Design a binder for this molecule. Structure first.
Ligand SMILES: Nc1ncnc2c1ncn2[C@@H]1O[C@H](COP(=O)(O)OP(=O)(O)OP(=O)(O)O)[C@@H](O)[C@H]1O
Ligand SMILES: Nc1ncnc2c1ncn2[C@@H]1O[C@H](COP(=O)(O)OP(=O)(O)OP(=O)(O)O)[C@@H](O)[C@H]1O
Ligand SMILES: Nc1ncnc2c1ncn2[C@@H]1O[C@H](COP(=O)(O)OP(=O)(O)OP(=O)(O)O)[C@@H](O)[C@H]1O
Ligand SMILES: Nc1ncnc2c1ncn2[C@@H]1O[C@H](COP(=O)(O)OP(=O)(O)O)[C@@H](O)[C@H]1O
Ligand SMILES: [Mg+2]
Ligand SMILES: [Mg+2]
Ligand SMILES: [Mg+2]
Ligand SMILES: [Mg+2]
Lengths: 152, 385, 54, 244, 390, 242, 55, 240, 125
């Protein structure tokens, strides 16, 4: 899949290694980049390959509380995930919001998985000098980007 | 260029000299200190020794006793003795006990928390007012109630009456509400707390009410303060099951939001700033004017305001004589300011794909076609109903 | 007679409510005119709204 | 009681939109693609089936092309069952005008009345809107060749080209480049296969996934001819533009 | 450009190099409370600190056996005995006592229950809202003075009649009239202990967690004489009697039933006056609004057109105003307006005096100001719906 | 959704409570009935200086001795004016005689009752509403000048004077002081304007006010816009003597 | 024996007066106490309100 | 069969569906009306701009009802077809029974009549259409302009605008059309109606359609050339 | 008595397609199998017979029927909706081709008559 490999090496690796290229042009640094498509196409396996050359810590976040033990839930964890990923920059936070858990939660609220990604997004867009120097990328993934809450 | 470097060298001749002078006078120049500082440090240290066992104060008795509870568990009825002030003793506080006979040898303990980390902000935004310029008079109502009674105590004593309180930001999206707030907290340089309204709903039940009573005790302490509740609309839909949301969780958040901002509590200075895009779901006990004074109404700007708005974003980009800045504005017919900002991020994304490093008249008229296709592909009306 | 569908807790709420009316005047004895007038002060009634069509 | 069970198709949203109607505009874009092209010298009406199986008797079927009367043919996009109702109701209305004026129905009229029917389902009576859109291709003395399209809302507009069904945006930009106002009938044929051979979701464009029909004024003595081509003449012009 | 690029690389290295060396040195540099009198305390406190006066491992009695049985809070049970000279009346059931650190023996009994501490931070210390602050001279403000203030200041007059004095009072109405503005006023003037509760503070996930709280708060108010227990915002934990059959209304209805069985009580309440500030009497429970516990109930009204002409005297006399502002004139122009909105015309004429550059707020800045706040804060009815009945 | 059918367990048809709000939203309408000439005056509430003042109609002729002023949505009223016009003329074919004023109110009130479910073939040609009031004013031999107040309830009372609309509360309290039994036509006409001035949003002018009476000889007659401008001018002289 | 009905009928008031007057040992219990937040402390409170009562 | 009540009263004294009606109008196209002293002018902007889209056979948004009445409509365009239909019907049944063409007053009531009467029956949603009605009274010279609501209310106006961005052009008209002095001639009025549209159309002459009705059944449309000419004129003057 | 399903029971999904049409096929997929092969000079149609017991003799029930003497028909899916559908078909074939052209309908035309029934069983409430 040769057309996909270049598209993400352009907008993820290049405003980190060479902030001079994107600063002359004027383009405000990329925020969210949505990875979509049918399951099994390698949505996650592509960001894994980008996290190895750039030397990102690939932190797959998921809604899993097995790893969390310090706060014990990720509903209110925002600052702590940033402060571990800012120490250990560069980083790719691979936010897989599921949003295919049926129409009980996904159509009743916009799911519980997007709730955690919208709190993330508003605080990481401005926090310290990291807002046009983010070393913690906001990589989102979903089944179809249409299914996500409209305000995302 | 030179302006910046003269001042930066001026503060690195201050920092260097002060550190050498202040290190030498703690390790060589001792005369107002000397004997009297060597006796006081020697008396307090010998008298309490070490290790010192940290405890937590459940309650005081005024005859100089306390009931402290170790965090391990075994309770103790300790004595208040020597080298202690009772001004800081009070519930919740951290005291030092002597590990044999536990007497409160003093209080100096305050141990930061990861629950007071998420609330408090470290930020200092890299934009200040007049990068929001346009909708000019909408930041000149938030400056009359946030900035102005701190800066001039004179004018609000001269007219008398109580000063304003708060504001609500609501209106069309793409009207800048989020950066408007990020600008009134950078100007004043008051202690800016910041919480999204979606963290107030958690899977845990009745944990809502404990979290926002916490938020306001931190805020009262650091006062004067500005609290951003960004997106208090979000409390209207976000829910994980029907009892972690529903009437139950939504009433718990109201009740809480009602006590913090006006109650018997007799709150100190918390200014509140809310970002929102739902006015017709809020408590009718807040848009009661006289909690919240002037509310701010925002709409899509008009064609001459959008000339001031496109001039802030286009100095960033490379500049040419070819560029037709005035004709992107004209054609747009009351279109928001979040699109104007999605068009100049799209001009350098087409520019990089070519590997041509000039932004000219051609790159901006191409980037407007991509911005008008996503919002127009999502308009599936086609033949107008 | 002058009460009906008063439960015993409203009626303790009538005899006390009468002897306030006696403390407002200043009287030291609560007469039979105040127990009648305390009945209208505690009925679990203040009428929802004067009728507009009934 | 029964009000709970009531869908309220009829009601307006807080957008003021008919949410029901928007859904219906969907069910068209699932169905196979049909393209309208106006030329000065004829009208090429061209649509590629949605069906595809290897057991389809292509010779026997029409399903995308119906004649209304001898001057007016429609191409169908949506559910075929729904369509079939409308298409008979059209045919009767055409004839009703012929008995009363001995003068074939002008193309504007016929379209306007179909459009009125559709609208009525979404005014009142809690019916579900038809899932259908037509391309109208028709000829009279008044205006010449005329093209129209009507959508399930009951609102019609004229055109110099248009596409309905899947990949509507894709089709529309290919035509924007290529159509010049002067084309003959034979060049118009060649632009129709060209626009259908890119958009097709199936890999090959085959003579048995296509339906082609013409309306030409090159029939002498000042008369118009329709003709729906056989599946064996569409095969001969598939090799003509080199698709095989 | 190039001459200045070599100066942007120094600005980056240099601002952080400085920054680390300065914060470690500064430290708290050995600042510990005590100061100048604690040196005379060092003579007294060194002979007592070595005594075993402390520690006394705090325990708690589980059974007086006519000797005494304590249960440590570590779980390990011991039989102890009298101290140096303690009376046998001190040792009571469920009381904490301190026992000798080594061989366990009661030295000094200690007051009861270590659950009070979430109930001592709810008590406020004389509010500053005074008693003339409240609008009008209504007869409704004197009813607050006839249920709470008057029978505790003089129990001589309610002893001659013979009546049980009314102990309850409910404050209810539309917002903006001050239900909490007159319950602060009465806490300043009566000089009786005021105990504010938030009724939505009780809720937790662990059921009957608000049962513990409600018990201990009720005892803490029983001990002090003359108190007032002001429950605000009891629409949560004070809902209708219902039974969904499927939800989690089962946690909610626990805290209400425990609120019911103490109010009436086995052992009646002992000089406790009851205030309820509710938004609505409409969802409130049928066992709380049933009249022996409410006694006399005064709904605080929307001020009339004379009640706003009165109120308008509190806010316009404190501003600097030219002489001759008839308080009737601005009260007419205004439609039917609370007193929380009639306070905001002063504040909007005060912010318009600053714009116009005036040292005086006049009768011109109040006529404009009315027009702006009546339009503005009238439009859009919050939700503009509500209902949820049928 | 509430039914039209359902009861509120207080005993009330939710819909009637909501109708009686719609009156109050609409524009002010005063009526003062005296023993010498009923005066009806309403506030037009011209919403832009572009819109022509006199196209707007809220004083409406039912016949040539029953005039009528309406408050609320003027649309709802279009149906109920027409029904009232027919019925009064029907009676004049059928008994060659003026319809009683009281009787006409009843027939309006009857149509008002209608808003029903529309069960079987039964004709209830409305399903909803009639959120408007009338000040039905008239003169007949049986009782002198009368004035009647219709509701959307299907409920009407006679009234010596009644205000309705936005400023109804204020106008009501001035009416209980000022109303009397000795008023003349000329004093009542000036008094209506004075109570209408207080609750008018805008300054009292004839480009947002319309006056009318019904007097025994004339019948119905709406006043000239020239006459009204003169009665405005005379109010301020008497007031500026004081 | 159970006592139920409308409020105000002195249910709680009578029961107390007649259970202390007849010198039958009257234990005071309120059901909201048997609800607990510990796991298995409510089952230990019922058996202990019973064990006292058998003696 | 279907008669389920859709005029559920709002407890706040409104009707949910009649608000929504007003909303759907705002979505759709714009159209402006101005009355001189001897002409009326109906201009409307056309989003029928789209290369390869006819305008000969596509129907314009200004419709002919009668010889001397003309209608323009904003809001749902499927719906417009009805109110045309009914009004045409009317126009003939008036000649038939009373003689004489429709008074412009009358036809206004009658269109207004139809829209009210869809809020009464349960089986039907309100028409989300507002209209401009214009014409000249039989054998007279009296300009008239009327506009109706999907409430059913109606009023004459000196000039009005309905559809999208009506606030811009109303605010423009307050300053630039005096209420005591109409534009004198037919060309001076037309120059004034163009100038009003060219605020929200963002130039172009191909977009906008301008029809004028004068007294004595003069229904005429201005063709592309004329439009361009006027636009250009306004260009030189404005520039200068 | 009073029908109060006057409104339609079928409506479009907020994702597009009618919900009940889609369901109705899944019910056809459960059914008995049957097949059809068109040959040059005849057609063959054939189905199996699924009973409850060997007590149920399935000879009496016919799953293959005649519409007209020349057009037969076979089905899968709901047994009872076949019983009536064939009746409706025979009856309206006769009232639209037996009176008005004598002869039994051509085979295309009869298919289309059946198709009108179906569409319409979805339009009416
Ligand atoms: N009136 C304006 N003046 C100057 N800049 C503006 C204006 N409006 C929008 N912008 C720019 O657009 C950017 C995107 O805006 P932001 O994300 O803060 O908008 P928003 O209205 O807060 O969006 P939302 O509707 O999602 O709450 C801003 O950060 C700001 O620079
Ligand atoms: N009667 C009054 N007289 C003077 N001022 C009043 C009165 N009522 C309210 N206010 C003013 O309005 C402010 C806010 O009102 P308050 O918060 O007491 O409303 P509330 O009655 O407690 O409503 P809720 O509890 O439902 O939100 C007060 O601090 C006071 O300045
Ligand atoms: N039958 C009665 N005779 C005399 N007094 C009564 C009677 N019923 C109630 N009362 C008075 O009402 C008071 C309150 O009654 P109490 O609260 O004990 O009754 P209850 O049925 O338990 O009501 P609830 O528990 O719902 O509050 C009693 O203390 C008593 O003074
Ligand atoms: N492009 C690919 N190259 C090699 N393996 C792939 C590719 N795409 C998917 N896979 C394989 O398919 C499986 C699914 O990959 P994953 O990235 O986890 O899926 P999803 O999109 O559902 O998150 C893996 O075992 C992976 O190795
Ligand atoms: Mg994955
Ligand atoms: Mg924002
Ligand atoms: Mg309060
Ligand atoms: Mg009891």
């Amino acid at each position: 899949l040769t057309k996909q490999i270049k598209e993400i090496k352009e907008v993820i690796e290049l405003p980190v290694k060479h902030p001079e290229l994107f600063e002359s042009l004027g383009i405000a640094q990329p925020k969210g980049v949505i990875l979509y498509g049918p399951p099994g196409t390698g949505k996650t396996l592509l960001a894994r390959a980008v996290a190895h050359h750039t030397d990102c810590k690939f932190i797959r976040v998921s809604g899993a509380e097995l790893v969390q033990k310090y706060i014990g839930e990720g509903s209110r964890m925002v600052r702590e995930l940033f402060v571990m990923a800012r120490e250990h920059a560069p980083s790719i936070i691979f936010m897989d919001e599921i949003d295919s858990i049926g129409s009980t939660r996904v159509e009743g609220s916009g799911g519980g998985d997007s709730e955690v990604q919208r709190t993330m997004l508003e605080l990481l867009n401005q926090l310290d000098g990291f807002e046009t120097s983010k070393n913690i990328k906001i990589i989102m993934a979903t089944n179809r980007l249409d299914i996500l809450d409209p305000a995302l | 260029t030179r302006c910046k470097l003269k001042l930066l060298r001026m503060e690195r001749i201050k920092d260097h000299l002060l550190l050498e002078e202040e290190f030498v006078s703690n390790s060589e120049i001792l005369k107002p200190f000397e004997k009297k500082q060597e006796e006081e440090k020697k008396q307090l240290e010998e008298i309490r020794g070490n290790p010192l066992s940290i405890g937590t104060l459940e309650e005081i008795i005024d005859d100089d006793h306390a009931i402290v509870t170790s965090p391990t568990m075994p309770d103790y009825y300790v004595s208040i003795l020597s080298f202690v002030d009772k001004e800081l003793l009070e519930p919740g506080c951290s005291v030092l006990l002597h590990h044999k006979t536990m007497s409160i040898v003093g209080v100096l303990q305050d141990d930061a928390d990861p629950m007071v980390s998420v609330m408090k902000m470290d930020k200092s935004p890299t934009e200040s007012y007049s990068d929001i310029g346009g909708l000019e008079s909408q930041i000149q109502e938030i400056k009359e109630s946030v900035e102005l009674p701190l800066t001039h105590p004179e004018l609000y004593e001269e007219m008398g009456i109580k000063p304003p309180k708060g504001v609500i930001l609501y209106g069309a999206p793409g009207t800048g509400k989020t950066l408007l707030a990020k600008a009134v907290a950078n100007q004043t340089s008051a202690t800016f707390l910041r919480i999204v309204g979606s963290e107030l709903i958690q899977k845990y039940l009745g944990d809502g009410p404990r979290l926002c009573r916490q938020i306001f005790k931190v805020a009262g302490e650091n006062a004067p303060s500005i609290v951003f509740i960004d997106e208090i609309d979000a409390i209207g839909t976000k829910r994980y099951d029907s009892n972690s949301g529903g009437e139950r969780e939504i009433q718990r958040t109201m009740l809480e939001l009602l006590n913090q901002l006006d109650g018997f509590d007799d709150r100190g200075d918390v200014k509140v700033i809310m970002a929102t895009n739902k006015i017709e779901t809020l408590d009718p006990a807040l848009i009661r004017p006289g909690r919240i004074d002037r509310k701010i109404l925002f709409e899509n700007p008009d064609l001459s305001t959008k000339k001031k708005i496109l001039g802030i974003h286009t100095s960033k980009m490379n500049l040419s004589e070819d560029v037709n800045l005035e004709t992107l504005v004209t054609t747009k017919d009351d279109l928001s300011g979040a699109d104007i900002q999605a068009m100049c991020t799209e001009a350098g994304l087409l520019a990089l794909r070519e590997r041509r490093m000039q932004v000219t008249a051609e790159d901006f008229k191409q980037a407007k076609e991509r911005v008008m296709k996503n919002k127009v592909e999502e308009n599936l009306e086609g033949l107008y109903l | 007679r002058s009460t009906d569908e008063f439960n015993g807790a409203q009626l303790k709420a009538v005899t006390v409510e009468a002897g306030m009316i006696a403390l407002r005047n200043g009287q030291s004895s609560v007469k039979h005119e105040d127990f009648v007038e305390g009945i209208s002060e505690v009925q679990a009634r203040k009428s929802k709204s004067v009728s507009f069509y009934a | 009681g029964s009000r709970r069970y009531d869908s309220r198709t009829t009601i307006f949203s807080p957008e003021g939109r008919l949410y029901q109607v928007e859904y219906a505009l969907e069910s068209i874009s699932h169905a196979g693609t049909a393209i309208g092209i106006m030329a000065s010298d004829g009208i090429v009406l061209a649509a590629e089936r949605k069906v595809t199986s290897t057991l389809l008797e292509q010779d026997t079927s029409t399903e995308k092309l119906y004649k209304l009367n001898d001057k007016i043919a429609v191409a169908v996009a949506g559910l075929t069952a729904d369509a079939e109702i409308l298409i008979n109701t059209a045919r009767i209305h055409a004839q009703n005008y012929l008995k009363t004026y001995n003068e074939d129905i002008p193309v504007e009229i016929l379209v306007r009345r179909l459009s009125d029917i559709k609208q009525g389902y979404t005014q009142h009576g809690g019916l579900r809107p038809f899932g259908v859109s037509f391309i109208y291709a028709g000829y009279d003395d008044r205006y010449g060749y005329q093209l129209y399209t009507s959508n399930p809302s009951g609102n019609y507009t004229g055109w110099k080209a248009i596409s309905v069904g899947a990949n509507t945006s894709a089709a529309q930009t290919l035509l924007q480049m290529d159509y010049k106002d002067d084309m003959k009938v034979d060049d118009a044929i060649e632009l129709a296969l060209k626009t259908l051979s890119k958009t097709t979701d199936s890999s090959a464009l085959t003579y048995d996934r296509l339906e082609f029909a013409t309306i030409r004024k090159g029939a002498n003595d000042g008369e118009v001819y329709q003709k729906i081509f056989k599946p064996q003449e569409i095969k001969d012009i598939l090799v003509k533009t080199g698709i095989t | 450009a190039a001459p200045y690029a070599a100066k942007l690389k120094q600005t980056e290295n240099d601002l952080k190099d400085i920054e680390a060396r300065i914060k470690e040195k500064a430290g708290v540099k050995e600042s510990d409370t005590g100061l100048a009198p604690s040196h005379l305390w060092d003579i007294m406190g060194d002979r007592q600190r070595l005594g075993e006066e402390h520690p006394l491992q705090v325990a708690r009695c589980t059974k007086i056996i006519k000797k005494y049985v304590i249960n440590l809070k570590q779980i390990a049970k011991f039989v102890v005995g009298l101290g140096e000279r303690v009376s046998p009346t001190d040792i009571e059931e469920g009381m904490r006592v301190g026992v000798d650190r080594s061989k366990y023996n009661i030295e000094l009994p200690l007051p009861p229950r270590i659950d009070p501490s979430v109930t001592m931070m709810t008590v406020e210390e004389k509010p500053d809202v005074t008693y003339s602050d409240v609008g009008g001279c209504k007869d409704q403000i004197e009813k607050l003075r006839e249920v709470v203030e008057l029978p505790l200041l003089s129990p001589e007059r309610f002893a001659t009649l013979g009546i049980d004095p009314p102990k309850g009072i409910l404050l209810y109405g539309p917002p903006g009239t001050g239900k909490t503005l007159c319950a602060r006023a009465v806490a300043n003037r009566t000089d009786a202990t005021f105990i504010r509760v938030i009724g939505s503070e009780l809720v937790q996930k662990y059921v009957g967690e608000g049962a513990r709280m409600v018990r201990e708060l009720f005892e803490m108010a029983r001990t002090k004489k003359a108190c007032i227990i002001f429950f605000d915002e009891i629409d949560a934990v004070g809902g209708a009697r219902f039974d969904d059959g499927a939800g989690g209304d089962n946690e909610v209805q626990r805290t209400m039933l425990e609120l019911i069985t103490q109010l009436d009580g086995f052992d009646p309440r002992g000089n406790i006056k009851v205030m309820f500030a509710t938004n609505r009497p409409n969802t409130l429970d049928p066992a709380l609004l049933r009249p022996g516990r409410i006694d006399r109930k005064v709904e605080f009204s929307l001020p009339d057109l004379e009640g706003r002409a009165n109120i308008f005297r509190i806010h316009s006399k404190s501003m600097s105003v030219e002489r001759g502002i008839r308080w009737e004139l601005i009260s007419r122009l205004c439609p039917n307006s609370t007193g929380a909105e009639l306070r905001s015309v002063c504040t909007e004429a005060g912010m318009f005096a600053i714009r116009a550059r005036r040292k005086v707020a006049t009768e011109k800045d109040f006529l404009k100001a009315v027009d702006k706040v009546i339009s503005g804060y009238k439009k859009f009815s919050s939700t503009s719906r509500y209902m949820q009945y049928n | 959704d509430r039914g039209v059918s359902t009861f509120s367990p207080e005993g009330r048809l939710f819909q009637v409570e909501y109708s009686l709000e719609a009156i109050k939203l609409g524009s002010t309408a005063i009526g003062i009935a005296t023993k010498e000439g009923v005066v009806l005056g309403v506030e037009k509430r011209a919403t832009s200086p572009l819109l022509e003042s006199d196209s707007i109609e809220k004083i409406v002729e039912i016949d040539r001795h029953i005039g009528c002023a309406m408050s609320g949505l003027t649309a709802d009223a279009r149906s109920m004016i027409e029904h009232a016009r027919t019925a009064a003329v029907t009676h004049n074919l059928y008994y060659d005689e003026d319809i009683n004023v009281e009787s006409l109110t009843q027939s309006v009130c009857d149509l008002a009752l209608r808003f029903g479910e529309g069960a079987s073939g039964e004709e209830r040609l409305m399903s909803r509403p009639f959120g408007v009031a009338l000040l039905i004013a008239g003169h007949d031999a049986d009782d002198g000048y009368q004035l009647f107040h219709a509701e959307p309830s299907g409920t009407f009372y006679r009234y010596n004077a009644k205000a309705i609309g936005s400023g109804s509360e204020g106008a009501q309290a001035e009416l209980l002081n000022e109303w009397h039994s000795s008023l003349t036509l000329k004093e009542a006409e000036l008094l209506v304007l004075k109570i209408l001035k207080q609750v008018m949003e805008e300054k009292l002018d004839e480009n947002n006010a319309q006056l009318s009476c019904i007097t025994k000889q004339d019948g119905f007659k709406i006043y000239d816009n020239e006459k009204t401008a003169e009665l405005i001018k005379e109010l301020k002289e008497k007031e500026a003597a004081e | 024996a159970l006592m139920y009905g409308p409020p105000g009928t002195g249910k709680t008031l009578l029961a107390r007066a007649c259970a202390a007057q007849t010198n039958a040992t009257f234990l005071k219990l309120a059901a909201p106490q048997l609800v607990q937040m510990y796991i298995g402390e409510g089952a230990k409170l019922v058996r202990d309100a019973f064990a006292l009562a058998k003696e | 069969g279907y008669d389920r009540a859709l005029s559920i009263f709002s407890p706040d004294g409104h009707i949910f569906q009649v608000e929504y009606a007003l909303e759907a109008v705002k979505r759709g196209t714009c159209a402006v009306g101005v009355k001189g002293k001897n002409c009326v002018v109906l201009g409307c902007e056309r989003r029928s701009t789209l290369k390869l889209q006819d305008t000969r056979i596509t129907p314009s948004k200004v419709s002919k009802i009668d010889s001397h009445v003309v209608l323009s409509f904003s809001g749902l365009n499927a719906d417009s077809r009805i109110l045309i239909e009914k009004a045409r019907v009317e126009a003939q049944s008036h000649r038939l029974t009373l003689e004489d063409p429709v008074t412009v007053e009358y036809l206004t009531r009658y269109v207004a009549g139809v829209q009210q009467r869809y809020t009464q029956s349960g089986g039907v949603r309100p028409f989300g259409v507002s209209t401009l009605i214009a014409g000249f009274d039989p054998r007279d010279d009296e300009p008239k302009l009327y506009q109706t609501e999907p409430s059913g209310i109606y009023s004459s106006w000196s000039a009005q605008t309905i559809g999208r961005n009506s606030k811009t052009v109303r605010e423009f008209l307050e300053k630039n059309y005096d209420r005591k002095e109409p534009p004198a001639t037919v060309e001076e009025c037309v120059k004034l109606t163009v100038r009003s549209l060219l605020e929200v159309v963002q130039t172009g002459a191909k977009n906008i359609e301008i029809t004028v009705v004068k007294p004595d059944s003069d229904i005429v449309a201005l063709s592309s050339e004329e439009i361009n000419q006027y636009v250009t004129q306004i260009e030189q003057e404005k520039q200068e | 008595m009073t029908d109060r399903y006057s409104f339609s029971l079928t409506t479009f999904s907020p994702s597009g397609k009618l919900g009940q049409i889609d369901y109705a096929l899944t019910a056809v997929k459960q059914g008995v199998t049957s097949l059809g092969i068109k040959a040059t000079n005849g057609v063959v149609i054939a189905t199996e017979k699924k009973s409850s017991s060997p007590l149920a003799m399935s000879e009496t029930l016919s799953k293959v029927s005649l519409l007209t003497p020349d057009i037969g028909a076979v089905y899968s899916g709901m047994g009872p909706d076949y019983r009536v559908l064939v009746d409706k078909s025979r009856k309206v074939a006769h009232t639209s081709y037996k009176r008005i052209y004598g002869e039994y309908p051509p085979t295309k035309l009869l298919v289309s008559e059946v198709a009108k029934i179906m569409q319409e069983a979805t339009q009416s409430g």
